[PDB]
Amino acid sequence: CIFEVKHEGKVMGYACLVGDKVMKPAHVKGTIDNADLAKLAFKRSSKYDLECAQIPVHMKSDASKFTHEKPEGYYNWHHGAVQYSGGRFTIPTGAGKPGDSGRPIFDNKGRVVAIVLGGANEGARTALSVVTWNKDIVTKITPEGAEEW
Amino acid sequence: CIFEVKHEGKVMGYACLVGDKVMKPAHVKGTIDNADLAKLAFKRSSKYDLECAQIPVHMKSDASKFTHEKPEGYYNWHHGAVQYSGGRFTIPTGAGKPGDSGRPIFDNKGRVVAIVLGGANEGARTALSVVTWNKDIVTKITPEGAEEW
Amino acid sequence: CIFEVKHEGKVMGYACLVGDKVMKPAHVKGTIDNADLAKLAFKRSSKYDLECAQIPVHMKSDASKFTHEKPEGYYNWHHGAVQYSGGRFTIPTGAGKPGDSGRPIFDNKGRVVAIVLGGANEGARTALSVVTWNKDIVTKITPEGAEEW
Amino acid sequence: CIFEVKHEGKVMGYACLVGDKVMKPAHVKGTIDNADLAKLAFKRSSKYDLECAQIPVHMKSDASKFTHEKPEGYYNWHHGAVQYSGGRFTIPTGAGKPGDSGRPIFDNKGRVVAIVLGGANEGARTALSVVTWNKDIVTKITPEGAEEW
C-alpha cells in the first residue's frame, strides 16, 4: 500500500493506496517508484495539498481502507506510536522528519486513520498536520506553524 | 434451492429459489435443468441483469429466504468463505470462475445474503459483483472492471 | 562504485565512480547498466580515451577516492594482485582480458590508484595501460603495443 | 530457453529458443521480457500462427534442440506429463490454460518434441494444438475445436 516517491534517485515522500484512489502529497517532488503507479493521471488539489488518482484493478486488492473513527488514545505509524487527543495527533519531537509525508497513521485494526503531511514543532511534542476523514469526506488538519515534511 | 442452467448439455450458470421467486442471471445462456422450472415464464430486467419468475406451489417449501442484514465479517459460499467489508464482498482470486453466477452467498444461519453475478479482479482478491437486498428492495453492486461470470 | 557497461545485453567494460565524476573508457560500447548513471551527459576526451560525467548527489557517497601515491610494490585488482615498479603496472599474462577496462586498481587502504584501459603482452607478464593521477592531474600510461581491453 | 511474453506487465504466453531461431506464437500479445530478445526482428507466418527470429550468438548456447522422433507414449511438459498416441498429444482437461502457449513438450532426453499453441476440450482430456517437426520441416496439428491459449 505504501510506495515511495523518488526524485533524482532520492526518496522525497510517499504514496499510499487508500480506499480506491492512489494518494501522495502534492508538495512532494518526484514520481512514484512503481511503473503501474507512475504512468497514472493524477488530479491535483491545492486546498488539500493532496494529489489523487485511481488504483489500477490489479492493485486494488492492495489498498488500505482508513475510517472516521478515531477515539482519543494511541495510534500506530512507522516510527512508533502517535497520540490522539483534543482533536490533534502528536509525536515525540524528532521522530518525524522531512520525507515522511504520505505515511499513514494506522489504528490497531489496520484502518488508516490519517495521512501525515508535515508537523509543527511545539516543544516536547510535534502536532502533526494530517489529511483525515470526516463523517464521510476528507479533511485536513494543520496545526499553527506546521513545517511541511 | 440451487438449480443449474444447462446450454447444449453444458452448465453455464445457476438458478436459485429465493423468497417466492425463481432467480437466474439474465446473461446466462441455457434453460434451467428442471422440468417444473424450465416451463415457467420469466420477466427479464436488464438493469439488474436479473431474470425472475414465480416458484410453483409444490417447490415453494424449497425456497431460501436471503436478509438485508450483513455485518462486516465472513460469509459462506460454495467455494469457501466470502469476506464482507467496506460494502464489498471479496474472495481469494481464483476461487470464483465463469459459470458461478447464480450461486448464493449464505450467512451462518442460512439466510441468502447476495447472489453472485461476476467479479472484478483486483489482485490478491476479487471484488464480487452481486445482487443484494437493501432495506426491503433488491440492489446490484458491481465493482469497477467486473468480469461477468 | 563499479558499474557495468552493457551492449546488446552484453558486458563490454565497466564504469567507475571516482572522485566526484563518473568514469568509463571512451572506447567501451554500450550504456551504463544503471538508470541514474545512464541518463547523464558525458564529456568525451579522445586523448585520454576517457569519458567522464558528474556523480548525482544521491550516489556521491558511493564514489571511491584514487591518490597519486603509489610506491613500488603490489596493488589490488579484481583478478588478483597487480605489481607496480619502474613506473609500470603489470600482471601475469592471461589474468586480464577484453572487457576488463574501467576496473580500478586499489591499494591496501582502498584508494583507487589507476584505472585499467588495456594491456600490452610482453611475455610472462602484461604491462597495463592505465589512467593514473599525477601530482594532482590525471594522466595515461600506455605501454608499447597495448591491446585495448 | 523459455522466456515470457509480457503485456501491460502481464504474462500472456511464452517464447522459446528452439534450434537456431527464437519462437513465440503469433497470437500472443506483448513483447519478450528480455532485452536481447525483444529488440529482434521477427518474421510472422499466419499459416503456422508462428513468429520466429534468429538467436543472438551470445544465447545460441541456450537453445533447445526439438526432434521428429515421437513414439506413442508419455512426454514431459511444465504441468505434468503429456500423452502421445494416434498422432495426437493430450492432457487431463484443466491442466493447460490460456497463457501456456509457447511452452515446449520435451521428451525424456530433453529434445523439444512440439510447442503448445492451444487445446481443444473433448471431455476428460484435451487434445493439444501443437507445432511439431516432420521429417525435417515444421508442421502444425490443430484438433477440431481448439481454443488458442
What distance in Å separates the CA atoms of residue A117 and residue A104, rounded to the nearest whole number?
Answer: 10
Binary contact (A8, C59; C-beta < 8 A):
no
Given in angstroms, what resolution was this structure solved at? 6.8
Chain C neighbors of D58, CB-CB under 8 A: 8-10
- Neighbouring CB atoms inside 10 A of C28's CB total 24
With CA atoms as reference, the chain A residue closest to B125 would be A61
What distance in Å separates the CA atoms of residue A129 and residue A100, rounded to the nearest whole number?
Answer: 12
The secondary structure of C50-72 as a DSSP string is: EEEEE--GGGGGG-B---S---S
The secondary structure of D106-142 as a DSSP string is: E-TTS-EEEEEEEEEE-SSEEEEEEEEE-SSSEEEE-
For residue A148, the Cα-to-chain-centroid distance in whole angstroms is 12
What distance in Å separates the CA atoms of residue A59 and residue A15, rounded to the nearest whole number?
Answer: 14
What distance in Å separates the CA atoms of residue B33 and residue C54, rounded to the nearest whole number?
Answer: 75
Phi/psi class of residue A57: alpha, beta or left (left: φ > 0; alpha: ψ in -120 to 50)?
A: alpha
Catalytic residues of B: 27, 49, 101
What distance in Å separates the CA atoms of residue C61 and residue A83, rounded to the nearest whole number?
Answer: 37
Question: Cell 601530482 identifies what position?
Answer: C135
What distance in Å separates the CA atoms of residue D96 and residue D101, rounded to the nearest whole number?
Answer: 9
With CA atoms as reference, the chain D residue closest to C11 would be D58
User: Per the structure block, which three cell numbers stand in for A117?
Assistant: 503531511
Nearest of A69, A62, A57 to residue A17 by alpha carbon = A62
The residues facing B83 across adjacent strands are B74, B90
- The helix (run of H) or strand (run of E) holding residue A37 is helix A35-38
Nearest of C136, C43, C124 to residue C91 by alpha carbon = C124
What distance in Å separates the CA atoms of residue A102 and residue C111, rounded to the nearest whole number?
Answer: 41
Query: Is D56 an interface residue toward C (CB < 8 Å)?
Result: yes
Chain C neighbors of D36, CB-CB under 8 A: 8-10
Q: How far is CA D41 from CA B141, D32, D33, D37, D140, in A?
A: 47, 12, 15, 9, 23
- Which DSSP category does C1 fall into? -
- On whether the CB atoms of residues A14 and A103 are closer than 8 A, the answer is yes
Query: Is C10 an interface residue toward D (CB < 8 Å)?
Result: yes
Q: How many residues does chain C have?
A: 149
Q: How far is CA B70 from CA B89, B109, B128, in A?
A: 10, 12, 15
What distance in Å separates the CA atoms of residue D30 and residue D42, rounded to the nearest whole number?
Answer: 13
What distance in Å separates the CA atoms of residue A12 and residue A2, rounded to the nearest whole number?
Answer: 13
Q: How far is CA D13 from CA A35, B25, C29, D127, in A?
A: 21, 33, 33, 19
Q: How far is CA B84 from CA A67, A130, C111, in A?
A: 16, 29, 62
A with B: touching (≥3 Cβ pairs within 8 Å)? yes
Chain A neighbors of D10, CB-CB under 8 A: 58
Type of residue numbered B12: M
Nearest of A102, A82, A131, A95 to residue A3 by alpha carbon = A102
User: Per the structure block, which three cell numbers stand in for C148?
Assistant: 585495448
Nearest-Cα distance to chain A for C73, in Å, is 40
CA angle D130, D131, D133 (to 5 degrees): 130
The 3-state DSSP composition of chain A as helix, strand, coil percent (nearest 5) reads 5, 50, 45
Phi/psi class of residue C87: alpha, beta or left (left: φ > 0; alpha: ψ in -120 to 50)?
A: left
> Dihedral of CA B34/B35/B36/B39: which sign?
positive
What distance in Å separates the CA atoms of residue B27 and residue B44, rounded to the nearest whole number?
Answer: 10
What distance in Å separates the CA atoms of residue B133 and residue B104, rounded to the nearest whole number?
Answer: 12
Binary contact (C10, D35; C-beta < 8 A):
no
Q: Tell me if residue A60 falls in helix, strand or coil.
A: helix
The secondary structure of D33-96 as a DSSP string is: SSHHHHTS--EEETTTTEEEEE--GGGGGG-B---S---SEEEEETTEEEEEETTEEEEETTS-
With CA atoms as reference, the chain A residue closest to D8 would be A36
Query: Is D79 an annotated catalytic residue?
Result: no
Nearest of A2, A12, A77, A63 to residue A34 by alpha carbon = A2
With CA atoms as reference, the chain D residue closest to A35 would be D9
The secondary structure of chain B as a DSSP string is: -EEEEEETTEEEEEEE-BTTEEB--TT--SEESSHHHHTS--EEETTTTEEEEE--GGGGGG-B---S---SEEEEETTEEEEEETTEEEEETTS--TT-TT-EEE-TTS-EEEEEEEEEE-SSEEEEEEEEE-SSSEEEE--TT-EE-
Chain A neighbors of B122, CB-CB under 8 A: 55, 57-61
Torsion angle of C-alpha atoms C104, C108, C113, C119, degrees rounded to 10 = -50
Nearest of C26, C34, C30, C99 to residue D36 by alpha carbon = C30
What distance in Å separates the CA atoms of residue B64 and residue C107, rounded to the nearest whole number?
Answer: 83
Query: Is A39 an interface residue toward D (CB < 8 Å)?
Result: no
Q: Tell me which of B91, B121, B122 to substitute to probe the interface with A (most A C-beta atoms closer than 10 Å).
A: B122
Which segments within chain C are labelled E, that is strand?
Answer: 2-7, 10-16, 21-22, 31-32, 43-45, 50-54, 73-77, 80-85, 88-92, 104-106, 112-121, 125-133, 138-141, 147-148
List Cβ neighbours of A66 (8 Å cut-off, separation of 6 or more): A18, A19, A104, A111, A112, A113, A114, A115, A133
φ, ψ of residue A100 to 5 degrees: the values are -110, 0
- The helix (run of H) or strand (run of E) holding residue C37 is helix C35-38
Q: How far is CA C103 from CA C8, C22, C67, in A?
A: 20, 13, 16
What distance in Å separates the CA atoms of residue D111 and residue B49, rounded to the nearest whole number?
Answer: 52
- On whether the CB atoms of residues C105 and C64 are closer than 8 A, the answer is no
Question: Cell 471431455 identifies what position?
Answer: D123
D with B: touching (≥3 Cβ pairs within 8 Å)? no
For residue A119, the Cα-to-chain-centroid distance in whole angstroms is 12
